[PDB]
Design a protein around this ligand. Structure first.
Ligand SMILES: [Mg+2]
Ligand SMILES: [Mg+2]
Ligand SMILES: [Mg+2]
Ligand SMILES: [Mg+2]
Ligand SMILES: [Mg+2]
Ligand SMILES: [Mg+2]
Ligand SMILES: [Mg+2]
Ligand SMILES: [Mg+2]
Ligand SMILES: [Mg+2]
Ligand SMILES: [Mg+2]
Ligand SMILES: [Mg+2]
Ligand SMILES: [Mg+2]
Ligand SMILES: [Mg+2]
Ligand SMILES: [Mg+2]
Ligand SMILES: [Mg+2]
Ligand SMILES: [Mg+2]
Ligand SMILES: [Mg+2]
Ligand SMILES: [Mg+2]
Ligand SMILES: [Mg+2]
Ligand SMILES: [Mg+2]
Ligand SMILES: [Mg+2]
Ligand SMILES: [Mg+2]
Ligand SMILES: [Mg+2]
Ligand SMILES: [Mg+2]
Ligand SMILES: [Mg+2]
Ligand SMILES: [Mg+2]
Lengths: 60, 144, 185, 260, 67
RNA sequence: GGACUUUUACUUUGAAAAAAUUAGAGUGUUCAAAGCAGGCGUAUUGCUCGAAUAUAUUAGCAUGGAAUAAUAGAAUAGGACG
RNA sequence: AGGAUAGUGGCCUACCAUGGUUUCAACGGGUAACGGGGAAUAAGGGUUCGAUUCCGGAGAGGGAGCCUGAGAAACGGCUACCACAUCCAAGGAAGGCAGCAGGCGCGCAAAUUACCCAAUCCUAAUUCAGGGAGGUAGUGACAAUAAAUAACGAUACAGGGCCCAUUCGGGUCUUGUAAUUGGAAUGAGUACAAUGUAAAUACCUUAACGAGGAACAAUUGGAGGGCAAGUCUGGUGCCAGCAGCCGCGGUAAUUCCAGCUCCAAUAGCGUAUAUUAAAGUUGUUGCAGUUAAAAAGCUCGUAGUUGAACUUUGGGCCCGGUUGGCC
């Protein structure tokens, strides 16, 4: 039941993670327009229906 | 008659039997004993404040293997010593010693979380500043 | 010390947060009706819950019960007045069968779209929010207005709207000013 | 505690005053006077809320201080004066006369009477007793002490008071078949004739009353006020005559006379 | 727009029954010059400490300080 | 007013159970939460609808019922009828 | 029996009697108890809460006592003591925010030393004076209501078409993509004014300004399962960390640290603690007790609970309210 483990490595992985900045991109619509986008994306633009539907495909 | 009395005039027996047997329940026993106010680090409250006495490296329970980076805190309103986990990558650097910290339970109503042995509180704020705000760089600790 | 003001919550949230069936059906309602939230669906489902509960205990009461007659007729009258319940099927058994789509059909946003006048539900909403529709002689900028079956023939463009008259609109005015500036007098 | 209360919080006033929930922490607390607090109608409530002659209490006081209003033939400049059942309210301006009679919803109605009706009121005999010097007297429901009553007058009877002189003109006994007016309880405002009166010695005599359409109800004797013989009241009844329509038929006539 | 209107049978009764604030609204009165509510209350509480007219107190205070 | 009173549980109806609140009737607060308003003319000298209703448990009160479950009665007749 | 009281009463006194309550829970102890109207949740039954807008009660640092008064055992009345505490020239003198605002302290935890009597009402000798009662505004993501952050064209490729579009045109029909391209629309904001108001602030209304990245840029959590959403890419290599729980991490990590993409709710979304449902895991409805936890070793037995059947049934007559049923 030791309580005096090493504390030197705290924050290691985070501090050594290669910093990359977010890529600026066009803003999404907010509110009723975004629900409109979701509706066309899932029910009108429906092209890939793997299983029943697919929502975040990986590259393949 | 499968046990219990069924007479129209057996209300006293049934209510007393229920009173006797509600002591077998954890929540009813704790509430009626007032154990949160009496025997609990937080005196029944949701959060508490304390002073960091020392930084601890707690070795996590098997099969995990890690140093969990808790702090010993002395509560302002009680003087009781507790161990509080400091949640995030880093964030032990933000805590330091002799700093005031706002502690919370973790969600298991007592009952130490996960692989962290004997630790039932987590640091939420340090020096009046959210650990989340410090970890995400939204804000800074007041040095003076 | 004063009489407390009364207030109520107008929605409830569903039981299971993540049901693919409910999520799909809600998004289909939002897309078909141009809604902003799932709360807009929840508010209707909440209204059905109160209506269905009231109709339910009334139907528990036997026929010719004075309370069942009085309240059941008032509930039937209101739902027929708003158009959710058809002019026929004027019964408590039929108010029990009402759907969310029935109520969403009577929103001003839907009625502005279905009476020409908007060419879209999303167009209908922005026109409504932008004070272009008067239900009678009264501008109504709430898309959830519940047209009550006597106002349908009175829904039109606001008289103080550039689609109603008397002003050609702020942006049109600035652009016409620029053209006058470039051209002359 | 420690003494009499001077305030009446809104939401603690009598409901039949029909005061709005909001727009005020308080209600007019009726002054001490002829009628009990819960059974009264303060002059400010009558002039402002019911007759709309005044927009606020300041205007009610302005009206009263010029000595326009009078209750039973006296000016009553008091704003919270506790006018009650069968009180006569005269406005010399507008030449208007009112008698405070409950409508069939248990609320004081704006009921107009003529000058000849306003010349008198009716009082229910609360007690009959010998005073000092052995002089008999009756006490009415509005606190009037009337000396030398007719010996035939008993308790629960009704007297006609001249209201110019505090004198009894005639009286009505309390017997089966006589028209009565319900002045309390859940049947307040109903009018009918006594079918019979059951005693219950030691407490709470009850009265069986049926109205025009043969609807019977039972009320405690304390709420029963004799107002005439079979038909033909001694007072001008308000609209409705205490029939107590049901809500269904109430609604039927709403939709009848609202659509012409 | 919807409001409320009062028409009096003459100006004098208008000035008798109308509130002061409405008469000041119409220029029919003048907004009386009075001190702040706190100033009036503080002056009243200061004058509670004097018994009588107080000019005897002022005379004695002057004479005691002078001699 | 009685040579006049077996007691009780239970259930029915009535009443009572402040207002707010709860349910609920009406009413386009622009909708809604709300609020108790308001509506209609001939706006030329005012006419008119409302501010309901239900529930509110036990105890007490009045009332109908007399199944259910207790209780009491004439046996040393000290019985009833008269 | 007397005394006292406004009055009943061991309320008190004198004398007298030996009573009074209690396993139907007296007496005592605890309460992170003021009581109720009510509140949350809930199929029904229930469970938890109610310091707090109304009603009743109690108190004004803690006790006690009393004056005036119709009414107070009053505290923005007094007297004394106890605790705390202010001024002082040391002689003395003055105190009571559980009123409003405000300060300290305590803490996870709660706002302005503002304006006004215009309204609601209340008091007074009183229409007039006064009222931190009350109202107004300020702070305020407690809770609640509604509901912006875009809409619509033209140009790009889809394709579902008909005379076997032959191989595509036809005045097909544009739902989706072209960080293009076009003119429209509006309030967030800002203000003439009016309205509002006791005076103002704001709202409602409104002249003139007010979107192109319409930067006038929505967030909070998540993406193995529960549980909606990636086996994409870089990092780390049982470390750092994550993880309510099962589990991830030891060199291909869908679970950590990030970027991209996606999902959920959305002006809100997480976290802790409590409580309700889920819990038929408290059970009356409605649990279980051979072996999973639980039939006393056995019998007697009081209080409790429960307790076989039987006493006017049957038939007949009359009144007599309701649905329609036939002009
Ligand atoms: Mg048992
Ligand atoms: Mg008081
Ligand atoms: Mg509404
Ligand atoms: Mg005595
Ligand atoms: Mg306490
Ligand atoms: Mg309580
Ligand atoms: Mg309480
Ligand atoms: Mg407390
Ligand atoms: Mg007191
Ligand atoms: Mg204190
Ligand atoms: Mg005192
Ligand atoms: Mg004080
Ligand atoms: Mg006081
Ligand atoms: Mg204070
Ligand atoms: Mg707070
Ligand atoms: Mg005032
Ligand atoms: Mg206050
Ligand atoms: Mg924005
Ligand atoms: Mg990730
Ligand atoms: Mg999934
Ligand atoms: Mg259940
Ligand atoms: Mg079990
Ligand atoms: Mg076992
Ligand atoms: Mg044995
Ligand atoms: Mg055994
Ligand atoms: Mg039996």
């Amino acid at each position: 039941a030791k309580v005096h483990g090493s504390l030197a490595r705290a924050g290691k992985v985070k501090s050594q993670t290669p910093k990359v900045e977010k890529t600026e991109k066009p803003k999404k619509p907010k509110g009723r327009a975004y629900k409109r986008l979701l509706y066309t994306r899932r029910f009108v633009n429906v092209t890939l229906v793997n299983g029943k539907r697919r929502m975040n495909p990986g590259p393949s | 008659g499968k046990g219990k009395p069924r007479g129209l005039n057996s209300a006293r027996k049934l209510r007393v039997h229920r009173r006797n047997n509600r002591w077998a329940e954890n929540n009813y026993k704790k509430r009626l004993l007032g154990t949160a106010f009496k025997s609990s680090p937080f005196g029944g409250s949701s959060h508490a404040k304390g002073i960091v006495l020392e930084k601890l490296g707690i070795e996590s329970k098997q099969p995990n293997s890690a140093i969990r980076k808790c702090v010993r805190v002395q509560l302002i309103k009680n003087g009781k010593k507790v161990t509080a986990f400091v949640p995030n990558d880093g964030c032990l650097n933000f805590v330091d010693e002799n700093d005031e910290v706002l502690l919370a339970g973790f969600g298991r109503k007592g009952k130490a979380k996960g692989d962290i042995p004997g630790v039932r509180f987590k640091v939420v704020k340090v020096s009046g500043v959210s650990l989340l705000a410090l970890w995400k760089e939204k804000k800074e600790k007041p040095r003076s | 010390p004063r009489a407390p003001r009364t207030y109520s919550k107008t929605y409830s949230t569903p039981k299971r947060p993540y049901e693919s069936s409910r999520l799909d059906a809600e998004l289909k309602l939002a897309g078909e009706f141009g809604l902003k939230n799932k709360k807009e669906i929840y508010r209707i489902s909440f209204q059905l819950s109160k209506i269905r509960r009231a109709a339910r205990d009334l139907l528990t009461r036997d026929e010719k019960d004075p309370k069942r007659l009085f309240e059941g007729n008032a509930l039937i009258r209101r739902l027929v007045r708003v158009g959710v319940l058809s002019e026929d099927k004027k019964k408590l058994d039929y108010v029990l069968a009402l759907k969310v789509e029935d109520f969403l059909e009577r929103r001003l946003q839907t009625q502005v779209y279905k009476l020409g006048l908007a060419k879209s539900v999303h167009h209908a909403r922005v026109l409504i929010t932008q004070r272009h529709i008067a239900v009678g002689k009264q501008i109504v900028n709430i898309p959830s207005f519940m047209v009550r079956l006597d106002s349908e023939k009175h829904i039109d463009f606001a008289p103080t709207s550039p689609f109603g008259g008397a002003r050609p609109g702020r942006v049109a005015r600035r652009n016409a000013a620029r053209k006058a500036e470039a051209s002359g007098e | 505690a420690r003494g009499p209360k001077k305030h009446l919080k809104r939401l603690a006033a009598p409901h039949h005053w029909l005061l709005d929930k909001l727009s005020g922490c308080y209600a007019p607390r009726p002054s001490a006077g002829p009628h009990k607090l819960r059974e009264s109608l303060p002059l400010i409530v009558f002039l402002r809320n019911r007759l709309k002659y005044a927009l606020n209490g300041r205007e009610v006081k302005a009206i009263l201080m010029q000595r326009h209003v009078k209750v039973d033939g006296k000016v009553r400049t008091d704003t919270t004066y506790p006018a009650g059942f069968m009180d006569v309210i005269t406005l010399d301006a507008t030449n208007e006369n009112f008698r405070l009679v409950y409508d069939v919803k248990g609320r004081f109605a704006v009921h107009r009477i003529t000058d000849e009706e306003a010349s008198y009121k009716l009082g229910k005999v609360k007690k009959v007793q010998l005073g000092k010097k052995g002089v008999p007297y009756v006490v009415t429901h509005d606190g009037r002490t009337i000396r030398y009553p007719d010996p035939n007058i008993k308790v629960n009877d009704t007297v006609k008071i001249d209201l110019a002189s505090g004198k009894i003109t005639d009286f009505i006994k309390f017997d089966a078949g006589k028209l009565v007016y319900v002045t309390g309880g859940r049947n307040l405002g109903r009018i009918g004739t006594i079918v019979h009166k059951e005693r219950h010695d030691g407490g709470f005599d009850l009265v069986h009353i049926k109205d025009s359409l043969d609807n019977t109800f039972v009320t405690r004797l304390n709420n029963v006020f004799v107002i005439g013989e079979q038909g033909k009241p001694y007072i001008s009844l308000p609209k409705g005559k205490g029939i107590k329509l049901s809500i269904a038929e109430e609604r039927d006539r709403r939709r009848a006379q609202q659509g012409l | 727009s919807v409001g409320f209107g009062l028409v009096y049978n003459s100006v004098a009764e208008a000035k008798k029954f109308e509130p002061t604030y409405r008469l000041v609204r119409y220029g029919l009165a003048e907004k009386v010059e009075k001190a702040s509510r706190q100033q009036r209350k503080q002056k009243k509480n200061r004058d509670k400490k004097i018994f009588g007219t107080g000019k005897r107190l002022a005379k004695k205070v002057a004479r005691r300080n002078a001699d």
